[PDB]
Amino acid sequence: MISLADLQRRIETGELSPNAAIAQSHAAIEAREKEVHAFVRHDKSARAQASGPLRGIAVGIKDIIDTANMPTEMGSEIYRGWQPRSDAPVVMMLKRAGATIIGKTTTTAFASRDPTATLNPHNTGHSPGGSSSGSAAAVGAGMIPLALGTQTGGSVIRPAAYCGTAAIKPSFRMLPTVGVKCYSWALDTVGLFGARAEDLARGLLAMTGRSEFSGIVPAKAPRIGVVRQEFAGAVEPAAEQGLQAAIKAAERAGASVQAIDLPEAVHEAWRIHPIIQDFEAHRALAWEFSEHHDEIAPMLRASLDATVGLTPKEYDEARRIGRRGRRELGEVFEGVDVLLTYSAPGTAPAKALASTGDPRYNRLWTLMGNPCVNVPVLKVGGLPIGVQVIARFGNDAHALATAWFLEDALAK
Amino acid sequence: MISLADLQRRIETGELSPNAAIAQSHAAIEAREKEVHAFVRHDKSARAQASGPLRGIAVGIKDIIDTANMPTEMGSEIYRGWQPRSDAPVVMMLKRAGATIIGKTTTTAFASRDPTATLNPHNTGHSPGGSSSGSAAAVGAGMIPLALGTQTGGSVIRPAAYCGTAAIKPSFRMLPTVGVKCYSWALDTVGLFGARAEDLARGLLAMTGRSEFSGIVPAKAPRIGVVRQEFAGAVEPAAEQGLQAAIKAAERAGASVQAIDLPEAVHEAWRIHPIIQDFEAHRALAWEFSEHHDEIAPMLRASLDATVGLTPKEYDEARRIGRRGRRELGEVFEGVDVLLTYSAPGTAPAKALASTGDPRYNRLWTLMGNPCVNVPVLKVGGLPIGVQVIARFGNDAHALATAWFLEDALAK
């Protein structure tokens, strides 16, 4: 994988040139695309910009995010050839910083469950996860130092974990979703994929200009609360293996680790995430569902068909439950700086299963809104397994800080 | 003006066919559009649907709201001929209910200060207000029974007041802003224009399906708290003359009216509204500002050029202030059911002033999120004057109930 922070430092000292950095990404891409299929379209003519902290940084953009010079097909036939007039605000944040938009990464149809053709970089016989399939895969295959994705359920954390890349789903609404195809407005959150936590930090600093992402250093003796999300069901052995490995490393590094049970209100918030997501999806994708029903990919079409009956009443009640969940979750962070849990059920599912993985260990946090970060831990049978670091809402800096601490802890 | 609820009842009893109702609107638009210029595009072929609570109901759509069959030009030359791929979710809410999208109404460029060519129905030498200019004017000229607009500051309540129409900016985020050109995601709220409060209720019921909008009837002896927003400065005589008339009509109607101050926190919220708005505008209109700067309308171009320096730091601090204001405001609603205040600084400005009016008496409530309804009170020099009925967040039903109450109280 390519380190954004690495490229930055070298270019800044003159040690490495932007054109060279970009040329490298173009090389890495052409080197494995025929094998990974992480891009809907690759702009081979994309070149480095002249200035900005991100000059010389190639960035892949999930194809539900608007770009003005490349089509934005939403991973759907309904939008084949669709060309937005403008670049999405998050895309502009990168461009204004000097980044190079090297291509549009694959996305499942409307960022839902329908598998793309993209394959896991670590094993072509396995799914790279979803829905930000191309972004996680491209970064995991070492094609680019940065990629944007989105998460409604678990579309950022899960595929990152499956592909062994670092990634962060910032605090809800921090990054604008304007120009980003909506699934559920109460949930949709933009996310970033990179090699390490530090790369994610330099990325957000350039995009937002917020001091909090400047000068981030590994956390010292973090106070970690371990949550296995029992309400999410039985986890797979590999996932638990990763979590224990992370806990062990963290302890040896000086962190105070303690297992904790999540409030009843939070368990409920996890239960009603589907209600909010699906009720809103029907409104957000109303035009497609009413005018191009049969054209909607099979899995999403089925999930929508099964939920046409969700009521405004149960939906309003679900959101009420969500708020109670948030309010009680904040109390949990009075004794711990971060929470640590699974990033996925286990290793990435074989492509034959035709599944991008179950987001059950991811969804709660998208609804709570807290910043979440995936920390690669180990590999079982050659497939990556990671852990999820979560901080208090609005504390993305500390999340990245602790994720870093964790990365080095595992490095012995 | 055309009443949506009336058409609804006459259509439901079989007295009026959906086709005749729509033919009515086409003719009403044809009769005044040449003098009002309220539509960017009038789809003369638009037909009525056979079923649904809104069958036979023509609706005008502010042109920053996506439509799949008609262009969405954002009131800017930058989007001349721009054609969205899908209908925005709110448009679909209307269509699924059986409504007819009769055309796109004028909007100032990107919903800001730059005046449209639309003229006030009551006196073509005056502004119809903005930024939802055409929606207010069209309903005010008796062309259509319903129209959608948006509000970031006062784009719904102010033009409604200027044009003498009923209107509502529902609770923040109740209606999705998906497919609605963003100016400020922290503020943008979709609103509705209609003949009377009851028409707005029927519209929201059909659009949302929420029981709170079903069975709405005039409120009784409501508890009104008069707020003059002194922080915004004194208003023009006409505006005060209208408020005094409303208070008196309500009292003589059986309501208990009491002047009240607004928490210092609430005053500060009003102050930092421009910070949130303009900071986000730069992010939201990044592509336009960066790639088509000189093409942005003069006034918006000037305001953006003047706020390029707003920093993430002052921005974040402004939001904290806004949240604090939201809390301390909820308290105010403990003894009072609804607040009564000004809808605009006074009568509609003369077109010669090249101004859609000052949003100073509207901006606070958009940041607070509360549901606001404009109630036409009287006319000074032939120009409408209205008052703004405000309820607690989420209590839109009551806002409409109290507005219907005020309308009757004014009719004596």
Side-chain angles (χ1 to χ4, degrees), chain A residues 139-289:
Chain A
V139 174
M143 290 184 188
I144 48 176
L146 189 72
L148 290 188
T150 64
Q151 168 165 320
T152 301
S155 294
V156 163
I157 298 298
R158 190 169 82 272
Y162 282 177
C163 295
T165 82
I168 175 177
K169 176 203 69 62
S171 290
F172 179 56
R173 302 190 78 182
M174 191 185 125
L175 292 177
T177 46
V178 171
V180 176
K181 189 61 178 163
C182 183
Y183 188 164
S184 168
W185 60 86
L187 294 162
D188 294 0
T189 306
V190 177
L192 284 65
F193 296 81
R196 296 190 57 180
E198 163 173 45
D199 302 307
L200 303 176
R202 301 304 291 175
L204 293 173
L205 172 62
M207 292 177 75
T208 71
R210 307 172 69 75
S211 69
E212 26 285 296
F213 299 111
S214 181
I216 285 183
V217 61
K220 286 290 178 295
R223 304 180 176 178
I224 308 173
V226 179
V227 291
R228 298 186 154 72
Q229 306 185 67
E230 310 76 13
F231 45 80
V235 78
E236 285 166 41
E240 174 62 14
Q241 287 167 47
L243 180 58
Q244 283 187 54
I247 295 177
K248 186 186 184 306
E251 285 171 348
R252 296 302 182 182
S256 75
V257 184
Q258 69 179 304
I260 53 181
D261 300 295
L262 287 171
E264 167 50 33
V266 176
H267 293 211
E268 273 292 271
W270 173 87
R271 182 180 69 73
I272 59 71
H273 171 287
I275 301 298
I276 299 176
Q277 171 171 42
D278 297 334
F279 178 89
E280 280 188 9
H282 269 291
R283 271 70 265 173
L285 297 172
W287 176 79
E288 292 91 333
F289 189 81

Side-chain angles (χ1 to χ4, degrees), chain A residues 78 85 96 173 210 290, chain B residues 85 96 173 185 290 316:
Chain A
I78 298 178
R85 173 72 169 123
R96 286 187 169 187
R173 302 190 78 182
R210 307 172 69 75
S290 297
Chain B
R85 173 61 167 141
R96 285 181 171 193
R173 284 192 289 184
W185 57 86
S290 296
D316 299 316

Side-chain angles (χ1 to χ4, degrees), chain A residues 78-79 82-83 85-87 89 92-93 96 173 178 182 185 208 210 283 286-287 289-291 312 316, chain B residues 78-79 82-83 85-87 89 92-93 95-96 173 178 182 185 208 210 283 286-287 290 312 316:
Chain A
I78 298 178
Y79 289 78
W82 175 242
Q83 183 53 259
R85 173 72 169 123
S86 60
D87 284 311
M92 287 305 296
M93 294 178 158
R96 286 187 169 187
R173 302 190 78 182
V178 171
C182 183
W185 60 86
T208 71
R210 307 172 69 75
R283 271 70 265 173
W287 176 79
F289 189 81
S290 297
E291 319 282 13
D316 290 321
Chain B
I78 296 171
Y79 286 79
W82 172 242
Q83 180 55 254
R85 173 61 167 141
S86 59
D87 283 310
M92 287 302 303
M93 293 176 158
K95 304 208 312 180
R96 285 181 171 193
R173 284 192 289 184
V178 174
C182 180
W185 57 86
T208 67
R210 308 182 64 177
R283 267 23 83 180
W287 176 81
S290 296
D316 299 316

Side-chain angles (χ1 to χ4, degrees), chain B residues 190-208:
Chain B
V190 177
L192 286 63
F193 293 86
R196 304 190 55 189
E198 171 187 30
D199 300 308
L200 301 180
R202 285 273 114 192
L204 288 175
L205 171 59
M207 286 180 84
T208 67

Side-chain angles (χ1 to χ4, degrees), chain B residues 196 218-222 224 245-255 257 340 375-377 401-412:
Chain B
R196 304 190 55 189
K220 303 179 192 183
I224 307 171
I247 290 175
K248 179 187 179 305
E251 282 179 356
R252 198 169 76 177
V257 191
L340 184 65
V375 179
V377 181
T402 295
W404 193 340
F405 156 74
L406 219 195
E407 300 181 331
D408 291 326
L410 288 173
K412 312 308 172 184

